[PDB]
Amino acid sequence: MIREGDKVVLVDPRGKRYLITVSKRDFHTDLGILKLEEIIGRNFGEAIKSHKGHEFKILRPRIVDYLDKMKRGPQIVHPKDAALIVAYAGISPGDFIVEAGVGSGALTLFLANIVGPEGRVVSYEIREDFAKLAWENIKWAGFDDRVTIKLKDIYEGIEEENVDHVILDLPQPERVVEHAAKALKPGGFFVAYTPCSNQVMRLHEKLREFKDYFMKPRTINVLVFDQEVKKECMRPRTTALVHTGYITFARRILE
Amino acid sequence: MIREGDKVVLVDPRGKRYLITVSKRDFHTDLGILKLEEIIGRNFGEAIKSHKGHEFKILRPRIVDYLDKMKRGPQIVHPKDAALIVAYAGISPGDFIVEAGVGSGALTLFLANIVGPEGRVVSYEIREDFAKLAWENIKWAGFDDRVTIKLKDIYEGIEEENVDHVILDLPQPERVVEHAAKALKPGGFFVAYTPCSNQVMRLHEKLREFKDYFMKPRTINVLVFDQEVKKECMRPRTTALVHTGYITFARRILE
Amino acid sequence: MIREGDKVVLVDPRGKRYLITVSKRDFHTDLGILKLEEIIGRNFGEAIKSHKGHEFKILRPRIVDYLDKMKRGPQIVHPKDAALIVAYAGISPGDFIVEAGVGSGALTLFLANIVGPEGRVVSYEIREDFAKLAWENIKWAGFDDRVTIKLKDIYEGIEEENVDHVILDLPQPERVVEHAAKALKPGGFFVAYTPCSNQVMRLHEKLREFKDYFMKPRTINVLVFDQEVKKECMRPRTTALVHTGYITFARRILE
Amino acid sequence: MIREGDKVVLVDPRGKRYLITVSKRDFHTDLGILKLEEIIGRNFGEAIKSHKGHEFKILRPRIVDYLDKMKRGPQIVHPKDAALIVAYAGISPGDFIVEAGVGSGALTLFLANIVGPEGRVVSYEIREDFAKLAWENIKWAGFDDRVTIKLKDIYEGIEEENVDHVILDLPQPERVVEHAAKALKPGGFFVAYTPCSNQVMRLHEKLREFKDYFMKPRTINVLVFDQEVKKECMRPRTTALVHTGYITFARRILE
């Protein structure tokens, strides 16, 4: 059963989610006031009603809830891009990742979830304000067990050794190629997300310089179309998010 | 160090990978004969040469190697689609998944890797020939610790209870909606991959019938463009894989 | 030189266009009042200023100006789709086209421009209110020389014979296939625009029935991405119009 | 009726087209020998049979036939891109176009068709071998009435004045911006097709330099998806042509 201090997701009659901590306080919504105390001693799958009689269904928070409801500061990496980073670099339970910059911690949360409680993520960040926001998100999602933030400029070096992956979302990933070459295990991946084609060009210039340290690099971009499926009309949604950034992969190989 | 019986990835001078078991035998390539015995007692990152003097670099097999080099029978789910299944359903270490049909086991391998050694995948399959091929792939990748195959028609029922996700790649996923509703935990996901728009239509008809058992369903399709980045010319690759199948998600919610 | 009663395009300092008729009246803008009389006796390429001193440059109206500035009622066919209709059916100066329904006349204007003053477009329309709006657009663009509107339900028949193309944007183009087969010249095109995949399915069912009257049909959909090209960053625009409708072509062939 | 020396399209039972000149000779196909003399005195829509009894249906050649069946040398501009050039620049019957380089004449044929017999295209070309091939295509399609080829390097200047459009497919369109500014009518379009993002960047650098000569430039790229529509399965075709080149438009405006 659910206890005071536990987190839950409440789903309103419109399907909207609220990720809350269970306490003895009132929670205000546009559908009325909820007495959060009523959740104590209930089980997931049950429901409570607001003072206006609207039902809120109780679910266990999942990674999708934390990602969707986290506090956002610097531009987050979209789940579609995190998905392809994890898929094409083969990111796996138990991996050791160096990430930079932590930003809001959205990519950090996604990677931390995948690596599991015995994996490790060390995220570099130069902006101490952003690092504080990210750390609040990380603690909130319960991933302070496996994530550390370093307030260090990663262009100056990577301290960690025998790293499975170096995953980058910062302006000049070319400034990290040499450090990543040193830090990565044989067969580990360097991955960089970059909004601009200019950045892809600069990164590939640096990867060509370091050609004997990596397998052939690959750059992709991912588009996800939503479909509208009504009884009498299936068609793609009219508008889509067609660009976030390019993703470049290079697998480390010795000599 | 590497021992006889261990698996390794050998990378040839063109960057081509071979996923092999280390034994005392000759391994024939288009670049000459390798004495696999020479790998015994070496460490990852080292290399051996063929009888023609071509170097093969030694790497630890990762999930990407098993997925790329597995034996294929029935049409596999592409990594881009597996990536979005895992991302948008929040598939996580420790999850319990019911999958059908196992097919070649490509999606099974991807999901098994994500759920980790304490997660579980039960994959249903009606074709015993396909089930045998998939099981060989699963044992080969070392995931027989966490995957079971059931030779059962899933349209007749799901035996498992309190399942995190029901993940489908078969012709008529609408025939599984009612069973999945029963099997899924509150907040668990039903996910179905379907090549044809006709199938999406039939599935949504069934999900509308079961509207009080799920949150609003979402159907997507994912396109991944490769970029060609040469010193004097960056452009998308001329041709792309633009369609594999649609992916439909519906999260279980009670009443 | 420009005379009273002529149409001109005025381009403001932000690049915004106004398509106006030259008269002796004041024209109000957010950048001040223009004395349209000042345009009489000027030549294209010259400019006038508003009472606030903002310059408006004078250009000859082109088809792009009429299409961009026309009055819109029923949903117009987007220029990208009209472009592919004209390209893949080979629509040419001098052609005779039957169109339905006229709608706002956007597609009509595009086709009328391509066929030129010796071509002909007969556009069918059942809604007399829409037909009036379209006819105002057609007269405004000066294409009443080559376009006729028929207030007739095209599902009941096409009166015209030896037609180069039958071009459709209405809900049930399958109801026009038999009539188009009769009306079209050998080698002429039947073309239908349809937002929904369901409509494409119904249309292809009818085209299969009429397989001995047409070459193999082809259905496409067209996506146009805008690129943002700043000095330090080139990337696709973040959001795009990814779906308007499918376009189906079938070329008439006898027996 | 058809006369000796006329061109016709013959359509075989598989739907394949042959664009031929009618003479008294044998024409060999994989479906047998045709006696082209049998076409003399027939009308479009009729048919002839090969010596093996396979029927070939007779159609009047249209622009789509000439474009599809022309001789190709240097890489042609794809019809989808020509379509958007014509649509977004508003290319119209009677226009005067300067094009470079002529290449194989594919874009030339498309533009010549649109401008009609009273329009004019002057195409520049430095390779005399390519110019000869293009001119053969142009004469073959009957557009030598309205197209001229100049064996001149367009980077050295445009001789023509009061041009409606300058349309470019060559490596360094930035070298033509100043000449086009001089040659174009007020409101005329400069349009350039460029495969590489690097070229788009260089072109926009030059257009920024010439900002007071043009309206804000726009760069697009066009993707056309084919749909497979079978009775029991509609889906996009698996593979598509996703990249040919970017198209940049800038409309001329004085001062």
Ligand SMILES: C[S@@+](CC[C@H](N)C(=O)[O-])C[C@H]1O[C@@H](n2cnc3c(N)ncnc32)[C@H](O)[C@@H]1O
């Ligand atoms: C786009 S944000 C990262 C967003 C993050 N991927 C997420 O999903 O929330 C880029 C981050 O990189 C940080 N950064 C930039 N240069 C850095 C450097 N040299 N070392 C460490 N962090 C850096 C910035 O301060 C910023 O927080």
Ligand SMILES: C[S@@+](CC[C@H](N)C(=O)[O-])C[C@H]1O[C@@H](n2cnc3c(N)ncnc32)[C@H](O)[C@@H]1O
């Ligand atoms: C497209 S294959 C699955 C491919 C798989 N996702 C992969 O990545 O390798 C579809 C599989 O579903 C199996 N199948 C079809 N209907 C089924 C049913 N009712 N119960 C169990 N398996 C079924 C087929 O025999 C086949 O192996």
Ligand SMILES: C[S@@+](CC[C@H](N)C(=O)[O-])C[C@H]1O[C@@H](n2cnc3c(N)ncnc32)[C@H](O)[C@@H]1O
């Ligand atoms: C989507 S609007 C056409 C928009 C038009 N293509 C444009 O670009 O402005 C569809 C039009 O078809 C007309 N229509 C529907 N059924 C028709 C019929 N059977 N005969 C003639 N017009 C019809 C409708 O009244 C409407 O004006």
Ligand SMILES: C[S@@+](CC[C@H](N)C(=O)[O-])C[C@H]1O[C@@H](n2cnc3c(N)ncnc32)[C@H](O)[C@@H]1O
């Ligand atoms: C890609 S091809 C043009 C293909 C053409 N658009 C078609 O559809 O067939 C480029 C052409 O530009 C010509 N060219 C390159 N530089 C030129 C220049 N400065 N002046 C004239 N022609 C030039 C080349 O010789 C070549 O024939």
